[PDB]
Design a protein around this ligand. Structure first.
Ligand SMILES: Nc1ncnc2c1ncn2[C@@H]1O[C@H](COP(=O)(O)OP(=O)(O)OP(=O)(O)O)[C@@H](O)[C@H]1O
Lengths: 273, 48, 375, 96, 303
């Protein structure tokens, strides 16, 4: 008989989806809440409470990204560690929780559930590339939260799909975003081995910026910062590419901090040589 | 003294366990009759 | 004319192929002569490094000679405990080669199998819930436990009815974590020394450390040659001392790679109260007797590798005998196969399962050789 | 009885096979195992297995005595001051 | 045409040189063959099994002298041809395999087979009919077509333990089974397996299992299984290690081996308490045939 109730509940979720488009927020949320109470014991066999997660995602839009609504999605998604029998979409739902934490803008808040993200693994190399398409979203989340060396570690993972796309700007940007990490990342044994591996790529060779980036990779004696500002005026606004320029001097929070880092890393280069 | 465990066609190559030493593939001595030597029979083998 | 000359050339080509075979025979003879020169090397184990120049070693037969390394012998890889080749006359190290049959060690290594089926006997209400939850959090993130500062719980105890959760679901956990497991029956661990049992367990723990996913399973921990020895004049509670030693090994000295030494065994008659304290045994999971509806599900899983007439009411067969044992339900299926073997029926009719269930009901009534009770 | 116990492991058991083999070669013979208690006439066979070598010697006598073709022409006379100590398998008839 | 005939004549001259090369190859082989014959004949040949096979093409041989030697060159015989745990002929001083040698087995194993065969009937056993039927399923059904088991997917268990008080006929069922069904019955006892030299008993068990593998219809009966299968001794240092090694050898054949049901083993013990839990294991000796003391109805029939 519980299975019969579940069959009725499966019909309810389809009706609730039609209701969500059919009626305004106040009636639809009440209907979703009423089914939610009945299926508190019931597992999310498909979208049984995944629809509730979509409903809170809808509430976030209704509440103009209210933090409490984002927290409501966070707690329910946190509850659904193994709630959904399907695996691929369940991992995607965990990513949806993470994006809301990034929306909080605490940076640490995304990292707090990034530990839950740490449990998620092998999105890349999954069959059909569907998980790889999802994998692009997970790496995309990493930015300020990832370390300057780490952003490159994710950007190289993002680079594979645009390289398959071979977009004139996006594929070039995908390689460019990984290469720009060296300017903002401090010298290390790991940094040197990584810069050599990225250097010499045929696609990278085409980009003019890669020629500018080679100066740090080689000892190159000393590169004056004032000369670099003339050389990297294009980086601020290429007008042809500039697609990964956000990674460097995008603006202030992720740009001016990068501007100071470039001066520091070249100053570090001057002392090392 | 040693104990025979088996015999082979053509050259007999009888293999004998000495009593603690090893399985020795020893051919029959020149002054012996092959029929007289028998499988599962105690035998005396000169070391030299 | 020209065609006849071509045929003669073909015969010459066949002769050339025979010449190539003769050359191969000459190459084989050259290899055999080269082989004859080598005189072999005594096989021995390095007891210790007396000095960089000389390492003390013992030949396998037993005489020990101090020996010196040869050319590029990689003395770093010549560390004591490595099998070595010793010159027959020179008696000096020639090469480092590690080959050990290790039959007892193999029992202590990866001998235990893992059951691929997620639900061989079903009954996964807490088996894929509480048992999975406690092990998964350290396995996924030991560092998160480190942020809390609590030592990740080393192990959990699956106290349960014998056979239903003991014979089966012992290796089902291995599929749940998707890795092969090490079975601590302890029969291999206790061989000729009561003291060595803890040391051999430490060796198994090191083997467990080698694979981070692999989880130590203390299945049948009480089981031993004859019967487990409790405190007594002839034999004392060596196993209880090993359990106290195990607690020391589990926390501090031997905890790494987020490997869980779960004591998931209902075999021990007595459970240490100190072990029950949070840490050594943070949580205990209780396997439960089947709900009969659950037994019907178990019978279906057991019926999966079965050819049947198709007119089978499994619920009626399950209702007919309340075996309450996953092994007993598996027995019902096997006995039904025996009934099918009678009369040469490849298919098994529902009656054959019911006849087997009646025989199993008699087996359920009479049981022997069970002396293991949790707590 | 003392001769059957030997320093080497199961060396005595080999002798018991020889005892039957000698008995088989002769036609109709009686073997007097006086002081059967000396010939491991008990089977506690505890975990220590101190008597393991003798216990193997006792079992070898039992199988050769009866089972898979027994004495055939051998009559066995065994004399014991304490019958209770004797192992149950030896006491079982057919063997005696 | 004529040029092709001239080319064939030049190849024929090369073939004449090749015949000389073949004689030279034979002569080099003959010298190695003469040494090989002398070494096998010589006393230090010490033919014994290879413990393991190694590659840099290498072999480790334990001679009957119980000394282990590693040979950088595997030997004159082909490396692929050589099998680990197979008899190989060690060199007199080089300790390098020269010949594999004919396969041979312990004389005791050959004696175990009941060539004469027993003379007993299933009918003669009285009051143990249910146990007789269980034994038939364990041994006769695998001996007969296994197709019925195969269609179901069930597999007949290999290894049967009969445990009973001394009077009950554990041997009586075994003797009758061997007489009623002819399948290379083999006699065995825990004492017979035990030998003075360490590992000699293990060889005896291994050879007996090999004899069972050799004959498609094969049954091995081990009475007094407790003697080999005593609770493993915890005596420290000096102990009856050899007997434990024999018990391990039987376990090695039983565990993860003999998946084919052609070979089945029946074992009997007056006391099942002495037997280690390992011998029964899970499937190593799953079959159990308890023999109850005769019931009143059984006693009237037995008398
Ligand atoms: N049901 C029976 N019918 C006939 N004879 C029987 C029966 N049960 C026992 N016996 C007698 O028992 C003897 C068979 O040897 P038995 O199997 O008892 O030896 P065992 O090695 O001591 O057995 P176990 O290993 O079971 O203790 C014979 O004397 C036989 O006549």
């Amino acid at each position: 008989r519980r299975s019969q109730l579940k069959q009725a509940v499966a019909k309810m979720v389809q009706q609730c989806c039609t209701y969500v488009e059919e009626i305004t927020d106040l009636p639809i949320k009440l209907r979703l809440i009423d089914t939610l109470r009945m299926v508190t014991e019931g597992k999310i066999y498909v979208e049984i409470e995944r629809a509730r997660l979509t409903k809170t995602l809808a509430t976030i839009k209704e509440q103009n990204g209210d933090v409490k609504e984002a927290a409501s999605i966070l707690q329910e998604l946190q509850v659904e560690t193994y709630g959904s029998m399907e695996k691929k979409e369940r991992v995607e739902f965990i990513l949806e929780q993470m994006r809301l934490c990034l929306a909080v803008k605490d940076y640490i808040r995304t990292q707090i559930i990034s530990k839950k993200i740490n449990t998620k693994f092998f999105q890349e190399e999954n069959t059909e590339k569907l998980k790889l398409k999802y994998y692009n979203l997970m790496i995309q989340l990493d930015q300020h939260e990832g370390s300057y060396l780490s952003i490159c570690k994710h950007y190289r993972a993002i680079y594979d799909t645009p390289c398959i796309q071979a977009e004139s700007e996006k594929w070039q940007q995908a390689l460019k975003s990984v290469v720009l990490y060296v300017i903002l990342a401090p010298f290390d044994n790991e940094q040197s081995d990584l810069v050599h591996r990225i250097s010499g790529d045929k696609k990278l060779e085409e980009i003019p910026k890669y020629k500018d980036l080679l100066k740090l990779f080689t000892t190159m004696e000393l590169m004056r910062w004032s000369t670099l500002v003339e050389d990297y005026g294009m980086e601020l606004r290429k007008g042809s590419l500039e697609s990964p320029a956000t990674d460097v001097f995008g603006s202030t929070e992720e740009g001016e901090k990068r501007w100071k880092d470039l001066k520091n890393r070249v100053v570090e280069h001057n002392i090392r040589i | 003294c040693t104990k025979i465990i088996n015999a082979d066609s053509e050259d007999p190559k009888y293999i004998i366990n000495v009593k603690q030493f090893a399985k020795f593939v020893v051919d029959l001595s020149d002054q012996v009759a092959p029929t007289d030597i028998e499988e599962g029979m105690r035998v005396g083998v000169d070391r030299n | 004319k020209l065609l006849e000359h071509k045929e003669i050339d073909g015969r010459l080509k066949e002769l050339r192929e025979q010449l190539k075979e003769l050359t191969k025979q000459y190459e084989k003879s050259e290899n055999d002569l080269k082989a004859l020169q080598s005189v072999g090397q005594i096989v021995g184990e390095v007891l210790k490094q007396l000095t960089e120049e000389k390492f003390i070693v013992k030949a396998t037969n037993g005489p020990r000679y101090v020996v010196g390394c040869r050319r590029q012998l990689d003395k770093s890889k010549l560390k004591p405990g490595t099998r070595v080749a010793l010159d027959m006359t020179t008696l000096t190290i020639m090469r480092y080669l590690p080959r050990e049959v290790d039959p007892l060690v193999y029992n202590m290594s990866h001998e235990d199998p893992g059951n691929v089926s997620y639900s061989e006997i079903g009954g996964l209400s807490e088996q894929i819930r509480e048992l999975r939850e406690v092990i998964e959090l350290p396995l996924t993130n030991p560092e998160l436990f480190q942020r809390v500062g609590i030592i990740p719980p080393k192990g959990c105890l699956l106290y349960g009815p014998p056979g239903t959760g003991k014979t089966l679901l012992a290796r089902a956990v291995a599929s749940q974590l998707d890795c092969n497991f090490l079975k601590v029956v302890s029969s291999s661990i206790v061989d000729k020394y009561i003291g060595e049992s803890a040391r051999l367990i430490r060796e198994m723990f090191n083997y467990a450390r080698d694979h981070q996913p692999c989880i130590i399973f203390m299945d049948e921990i009480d089981a031993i040659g004859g019967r487990r020895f409790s405190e007594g004049t002839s034999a004392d509670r060596e196993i209880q001392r090993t359990l106290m030693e195990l607690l020391n090994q589990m926390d501090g000295f031997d905890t790494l790679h987020r490997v869980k030494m779960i004591m998931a065994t209902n075999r021990p008659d007595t459970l240490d109260p100190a072990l029950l304290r949070p840490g050594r045994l943070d949580r205990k999971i209780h396997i439960d007797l089947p709900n009969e509806q659950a037994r019907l599900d178990i019978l279906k899983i057991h019926a999966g590798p079965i050819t049947k007439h198709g007119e089978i009411d499994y619920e009626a067969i399950v209702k007919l005998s309340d075996g309450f044992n996953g092994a007993d339900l598996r027995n019902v299926c096997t006995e039904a196969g025996m009934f099918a073997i009678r009369a040469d029926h490849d298919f098994v009719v529902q009656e054959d399962f019911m006849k087997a269930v009646r025989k199993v009901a008699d087996s359920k009534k009479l049981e022997s050789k069970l002396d293991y009770k949790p707590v | 009885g003392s001769e059957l116990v030997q320093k080497y492991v199961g060396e005595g058991a080999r002798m018991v096979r020889e005892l039957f083999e000698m008995a088989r070669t002769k036609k109709a013979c009686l073997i007097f195992f006086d002081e059967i208690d000396a010939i491991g006439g008990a089977r506690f066979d505890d975990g220590a297995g101190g008597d393991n070598e003798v216990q193997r010697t006792m079992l070898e006598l039992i199988n050769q005595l009866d089972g898979f073709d027994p004495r055939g022409n051998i009559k066995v006379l065994m004399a014991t001051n304490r019958p209770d100590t004797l192992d149950p398998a030896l006491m079982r008839p057919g063997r005696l | 045409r004529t040029r092709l005939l001239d080319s064939e004549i030049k190849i024929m001259k090369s073939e004449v040189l090749r015949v000389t090369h073949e004689l030279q190859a034979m002569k080099d082989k003959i010298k190695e063959n003469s040494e090989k014959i002398k070494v096998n004949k010589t006393l230090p040949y010490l033919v014994s099994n290879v413990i393991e096979l190694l590659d840099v093409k290498c072999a480790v041989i334990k001679t009957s002298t119980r000394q282990t030697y590693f040979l950088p060159v595997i030997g004159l015989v082909d490396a692929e041809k050589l099998k680990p745990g197979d008899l190989v002929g060690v060199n007199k001083d080089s300790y390098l395999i020269l010949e594999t040698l004919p396969t041979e087995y312990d004389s005791r194993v050959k004696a175990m087979e009941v060539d004469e065969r027993p003379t007993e009937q299933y009918s003669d056993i009285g009051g143990l009919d249910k146990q007789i039927q269980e034994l038939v399923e364990a041994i006769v059904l695998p001996m007969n077509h296994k197709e019925k088991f195969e269609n179901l997917g069930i597999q007949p268990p290999k290894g049967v333990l009969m445990y009973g008080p001394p009077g009950t006929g554990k041997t009586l069922l075994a003797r009758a089974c061997a007489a009623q069904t002819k399948a290379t019955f083999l006699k065995l006892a825990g004492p017979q397996l035990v030998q003075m030299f360490i590992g000699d008993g293990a060889k005896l068990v291994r050879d007996a299992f090999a004899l069972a593998k050799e004959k498609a219809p094969s049954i091995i009966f081990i009475d007094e299984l407790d003697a080999i299968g005593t609770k493993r001794f915890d005596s420290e240092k000096a102990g009856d290690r050899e007997v434990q090694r024999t018990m391990l050898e039987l376990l090695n054949q039983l565990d993860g081996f003999q998946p084919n049901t052609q070979v089945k083993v029946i074992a009997a013990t007056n006391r099942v308490d002495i037997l280690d839990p390992a011998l029964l294991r899970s499937g190593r000796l799953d079959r159990k045939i308890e023999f109850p003391m005769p019931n009143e109805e059984a006693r009237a029939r037995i008398m």
